């Protein structure tokens, strides 16, 4: 049923920027009885989505002048002129003019900033968990931008792939980045059969993809 | 201030069933439909179906039959989806929404109702301290952690030092490994003075009345 796509997922914008988010149908949305149901929400963190913009181009209450619909047929496109700090959340698009209703995948309004690397940190399973049998190690992979960043846990030549839990904070507020953690756990026993352990770390920055190890 | 006020939090294990309350309040119940939506981790929204006021008849999403129910009271004014029957997959938030006959949009959200199915009983974290391994450069920040391992349900709370080594602090989005929830916190503090200076995550986990101290400790 009327798939509907959102492109982009994320949008760095500088507040002060104009930002247009965009988003397309796979059918037309024009209705037998002339009217277009396109829909956009505005879902702000751990919130209800919120009305923004009846058929294409109505504000809804209380939304400002600042924000503008367009498109037809198959094709629409949101628009803030100033962007402002209030801004900030999840635009997503749905469509009434086929039955069921649909809503695309939205496009996160992210703010944009300087290019980090990740500092990343390498832990070996203590002494607490050993005791137990088991034996997790632990990569912390943080404050870097973009978003993107991939995990290879390559334990000594033969890298692992089937035990990783890797996890993600948003951005952080306080001087917009990102931090990661991988995770990656073995049975104690596994574990005491291996020495080496490197995170290597690939983010589009350090073109020797930083690598830290410890050796058991 | 007109409403869509919805139940709380709801956590069953496979095979019982749920029922969510959302009551409008502010306005003429009758005149709008009530929609249900299903915001699944990830996934997309799935609107679920809606059941029209006036006649009382559910039209239920294709992809929902025979496990829900759509049912309502209108002296009460409120509406209830019922999910029979519970399956790990169905573990989503459930919003309720209030749709306008003429321009056919959602424009009033009720609050959310979450609904966590697990076949998991009540585990303590295992609190573990991850610390350098002999691990020198860094810049002149140390990175110490505390591995949050296999506690159920959520949530946990990490803090360190009590909540006054709050900036460098980084705790990470639970991720369930087998059946059961594993976090991670960590701080970056100034080397100048550390192991000098004390470093201890507090981890509390009130669905078991657990609050765990470690120190991090260079060894
Ligand atoms: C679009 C539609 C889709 C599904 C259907 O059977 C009816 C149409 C027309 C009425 C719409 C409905 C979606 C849900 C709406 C928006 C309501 O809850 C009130 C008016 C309703």
């Known amino acids: 049923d009327v798939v509907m796509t959102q492109i982009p997922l994320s949008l760095p914008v500088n507040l002060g920027d104009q930002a247009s988010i965009s988003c397309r149908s796979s059918?037309?949305?024009?209705?037998?009885?002339?009217?277009?149901?396109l829909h956009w929400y505005l879902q702000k963190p751990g919130q209800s989505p919120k009305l923004l913009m009846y058929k294409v181009s109505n504000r809804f209450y209380g939304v400002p002048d600042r924000f503008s619909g367009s498109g037809s047929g198959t094709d629409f496109t949101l628009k803030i002129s100033r962007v402002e700090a209030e801004d900030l959340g999840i635009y997503f698009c749905?469509?009434?003019?086929?039955?069921?209703?649909?809503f695309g995948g939205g496009t996160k309004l992210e703010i944009k900033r300087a290019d980090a690397a990740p500092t990343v940190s390498i832990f070996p399973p203590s002494s607490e968990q050993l005791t137990s049998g088991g034996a997790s190690v632990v990569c912390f992979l943080n404050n870097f931008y973009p978003k993107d960043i991939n995990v290879k846990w390559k334990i000594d030549g033969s890298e692992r792939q089937n035990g990783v839990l890797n996890s993600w904070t948003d951005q952080d507020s306080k001087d917009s980045t990102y931090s990661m953690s991988s995770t990656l756990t073995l049975t104690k026993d596994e574990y005491e059969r291996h020495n080496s352990y490197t995170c290597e770390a690939t983010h589009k920055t350090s073109t020797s993809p930083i690598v830290k190890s410890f050796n058991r | 201030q007109i409403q869509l006020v919805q139940s709380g939090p709801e956590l069953k294990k496979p095979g019982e069933t749920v029922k969510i309350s959302c009551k409008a309040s502010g306005y003429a119940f009758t005149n709008y439909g009530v929609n249900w939506v299903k915001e699944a981790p990830g996934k997309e929204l799935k609107w679920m179906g809606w059941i029209n006021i006036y006649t009382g008849e559910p039209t239920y999403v294709d992809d929902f039959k025979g496990r829900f129910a759509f049912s309502l009271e209108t002296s009460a004014s409120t509406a209830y989806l019922e999910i029979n029957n519970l399956k790990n997959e169905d573990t989503a938030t459930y919003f309720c929404t209030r749709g306008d006959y003429v321009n056919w949009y959602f424009d009033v959200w009720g609050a959310g109702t979450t609904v966590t199915v697990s076949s998991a009983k009540t585990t303590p974290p295992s609190v573990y301290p991850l610390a350098p391994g002999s691990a020198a450069q860094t810049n002149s920040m140390v990175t110490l952690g505390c591995l949050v391992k296999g506690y159920f349900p959520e949530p946990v709370t990490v803090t360190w030092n009590s909540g006054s080594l709050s900036s460098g602090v980084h705790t990470f989005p639970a991720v369930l490994q087998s059946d059961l929830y594993t976090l991670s916190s960590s701080v970056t503090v100034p080397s100048s003075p550390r192991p000098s200076e004390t470093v201890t995550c507090n981890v509390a986990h009130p669905a078991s009345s657990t609050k765990v101290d470690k120190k991090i400790v260079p060894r």
């Open positions: 749905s469509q009434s003019s086929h039955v069921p209703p649909t």
């Open positions: 059918q037309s949305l024009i209705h037998s009885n002339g009217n277009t149901y």
